[PDB]
């Protein structure tokens, strides 16, 4: 007997435990939206005495917690199921409520819903249903168990008219199962009256899984009041069983001087509610106010890159054996190609990536104008010298790295790559020099150092020592003097026609629509239209005086376009006295109705309220 009715005002609860008085504190949390569909689900298993195959007990998703209200006599509804598929592939829970006990536990049972539903199990003949669980019939690795006191206080309201209105709110944000609840029998029989009542907390404990679906435990050996039907499409049918789905909303909440919640408003229902939320009060005087600011959102995305094809020789530069010395390195330039950065870090994790400006994961999307590659082998200890502003024996006379270096430096061990019993005398480094090296140039020079006041003419005697020192590697010594093959990738982001991009698909060119565009790395959103500009053959980008791009030539079509921002403006609410009327009149600042406010579409208008037919 599924049915659909209105929820009205229901679901307010204390979000914390601190005491407050005469405060208008506002919060942003999971709540039950005002005036929402509340649907009576109905697990239907009772008819005479026979089996009555029913295919009922539908899987109810546990979406952002659930609001559960009930008027249950004693124990017909007992417990609940949370988990995924309840088998030996995903962890499962067990939450069963005794008379006064709780037996929550964790297990991976494949099947547990076999309580041997009897033919004579109808309560009209006998209501005896004890230990009708037959749960965790299988347990491969089930260890996490738990016991505690009952959550619901099983109290009888001594009559059916003033039945015990039982309310729970279930949420599992970062573990710590919340069971905020409240009992109230004041209702005289009707469903969901008008009023206010906050809900107190009970307990919270952490377990941790992707809990996905929900279903209450019924007394499978004692059932009644569930007739068979297929009611739907906003109808009415007795079920004695409720459900409600929460959403993350912002609420304004008032506290009585005793400390009890008295009233609350949801900021995202009515322009009047928005006005009441913006200024902290429940009465708004006649006038005009500002509430929010709407803006149209993009509908899709497009990427257009040149038609370049060719794999950059990153394999050639990385894999080699005849790298030269530190003082005399080698420089290489990357030509027009597309570069696959996946093999750099996703494979062969030898040493740290040591990124400085760009992150390795954020690669393969941005595009570059040129790439430099340098290779040398150094001290294992001198690795830290390769960093901006860092000084050392080689950081001043062998290799200087600029302050604002961008890109990454790649190094890996070379114990096998370079080890001679007699030592390696083919590796050199400059030791003495007149001045500190400016970044990125060579100081190679065949000359004898002149120290003191001895003008050596090639004597190379006292106070005249060779600046280049034969490094002399070792095959058996420990780390540090062990060889480290070092390569450095130097990028630059210069506003020029891009040369080397990542691997991306070039989609079609849409126009006259609010879309997201990426023209060789110019991220942004707007409406691409025709342009009448007179771009010269070497011109690439247009510009207004803001350092803001407003004209882009198509890369693979050689056609210029115009870029315009999305429709944008503020929102105003015109209302009379709040004690005179409740109607309003929304003003959309500086926009034409024909552009977009003539109708609201799904997720295309920041103001949530759309109570107008527009």
């Amino acid at each position, epitope marked *: 007997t599924q049915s659909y009715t209105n929820s009205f005002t229901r679901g307010v609860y204390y979000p914390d435990k601190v005491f407050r008085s005469s405060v208008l504190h506002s919060t942003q949390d999971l709540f039950l939206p005002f005036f929402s569909n509340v649907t009576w689900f109905h697990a239907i298993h009772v008819s005479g005495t026979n089996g009555t195959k029913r295919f009922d007990n539908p899987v109810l998703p546990f979406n952002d917690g659930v609001y559960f209200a009930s008027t249950e006599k004693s124990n017909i509804i007992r417990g609940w199921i949370f988990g995924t598929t309840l088998d030996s592939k995903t962890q499962s829970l067990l939450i069963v409520n005794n008379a006064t006990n709780v037996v929550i536990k964790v297990c991976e049972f494949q099947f547990c819903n076999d309580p041997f539903l009897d033919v004579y199990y109808h309560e009209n003949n006998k209501s005896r249903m004890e230990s009708e669980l037959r749960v965790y019939s299988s347990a491969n690795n089930c260890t996490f168990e738990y016991v505690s006191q009952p959550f619901l206080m099983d109290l009888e309201g001594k009559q059916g008219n003033f039945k015990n209105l039982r309310e729970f709110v279930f949420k599992n944000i970062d573990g710590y199962f919340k069971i905020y609840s409240k009992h109230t029998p004041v209702n005289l029989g009707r469903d969901l009256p008008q009023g206010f009542s906050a809900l107190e907390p009970l307990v919270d404990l952490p377990i941790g899984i992707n809990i996905t679906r929900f279903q209450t435990l019924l007394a499978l050996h004692r059932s009644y009041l569930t007739p068979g039907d297929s009611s739907s499409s906003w109808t009415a049918g007795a079920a004695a069983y409720y459900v409600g789905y929460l959403q993350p909303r912002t609420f304004l909440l008032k506290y009585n001087e005793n400390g009890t919640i008295t009233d609350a408003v949801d900021c995202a229902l009515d322009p009047l509610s928005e006005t009441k939320c913006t200024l902290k009060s429940f009465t708004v005087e006649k006038g005009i106010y500002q509430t929010s600011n709407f803006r149209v959102q993009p509908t899709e995305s497009i990427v257009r890159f040149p038609n370049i094809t060719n794999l950059c020789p990153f394999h050639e530069v990385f894999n080699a*054996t005849r790298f030269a010395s530190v003082y005399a390195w080698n420089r290489k330039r990357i030509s027009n190609c597309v570069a696959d950065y996946s093999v750099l870090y996703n494979f062969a994790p030898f040493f740290a990536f040591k990124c400085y400006g760009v992150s390795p994961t954020k690669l393969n999307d941005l595009c570059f104008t040129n790439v430099y590659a340098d290779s040398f082998v150094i001290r294992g200890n001198e690795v830290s010298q390769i960093a901006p502003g860092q000084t050392g024996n080689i950081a001043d006379y062998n290799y200087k790295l600029p302050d604002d270096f961008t890109g990454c430096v790649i190094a890996w061990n070379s114990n096998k790559l370079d*080890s001679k019993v007699s030592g390696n005398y083919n590796y050199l480094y400059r030791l003495f020099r007149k001045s500190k090296l400016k970044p990125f140039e060579r100081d190679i020079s065949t000359e004898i150092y002149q120290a003191g006041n001895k003008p050596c003419n090639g004597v190379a005697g006292f106070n005249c020592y060779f600046p280049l020192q034969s490094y002399g590697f070792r095959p058996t010594y420990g780390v540090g003097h062990q060889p480290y093959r070092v390569v450095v990738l130097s990028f630059e982001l210069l506003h020029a026609p891009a040369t080397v991009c990542g691997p991306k698909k070039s989609t079609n060119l849409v126009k006259n629509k609010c879309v997201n565009f990426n023209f060789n790395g110019l991220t942004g959103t707007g409406v691409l239209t025709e342009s009448n500009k007179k771009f010269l053959p070497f011109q690439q980008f247009g510009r207004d005086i803001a350092d803001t791009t407003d004209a882009v030539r198509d890369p693979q079509t050689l056609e210029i376009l115009d870029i315009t921002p999305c429709s944008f403006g503020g929102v105003s609410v015109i209302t009379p006295g709040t004690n005179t009327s409740n109607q309003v009149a929304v003003l959309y600042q500086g926009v034409n109705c024909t552009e977009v406010p003539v109708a609201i579409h799904a997720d295309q208008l920041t103001p949530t309220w759309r109570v107008y037919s527009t």
Partner: antibody
Amino acid sequence: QVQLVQSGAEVKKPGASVKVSCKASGYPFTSYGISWVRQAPGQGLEWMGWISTYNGNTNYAQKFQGRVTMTTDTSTTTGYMELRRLRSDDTAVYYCARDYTRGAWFGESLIGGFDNWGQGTLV
Amino acid sequence: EIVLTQSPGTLSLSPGERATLSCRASQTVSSTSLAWYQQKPGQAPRLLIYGASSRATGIPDRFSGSGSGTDFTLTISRLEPEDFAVYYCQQHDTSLTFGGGTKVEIKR
């Protein structure tokens, strides 16, 4: 996920040339070169040759200068061996391997050996 | 050029005994030149050791290597006789020439 396959056995008379196709798939045929090597019973292998991807640069040994000229087709993704001036008893198995010892553009040698080999063509 | 010289003439050992292999060169081979292969009968070569002690195709517990400069040695412990492949060694720094080789028999 290397895929290297070779054609069947071939017999050619002296004075002609032997053309054998080595098909490569599953890996990009530009990161590493392909080395062709020869094996005969009772003895090890040699430095028959190594072939690059984009151009004709090679690392031919000092034994067979003037004859060793193979080709590669990146469109066909096939290494073609076209050994000319056949010798009387050149009958031996040929292995095309994804080499890890020679570099393509600037000619600098690599590190290691021959990781993945071919299935072998017997002539 | 330089041709390798091998004198592990016969590995006449039963499974379970230690096996040692040597690949002494002529005059010098630098440590950045090493390759080792198993030549199974009627099969294709495959790389096992491309350096000092690294792994190419699995190598759970058997293929080990060490050495420095003029000496290089390969060690096998607890050998399982399914392979009985030829131990081939190769240097790279001085041109390229495969080693003599060493057949591995069963010793029934």
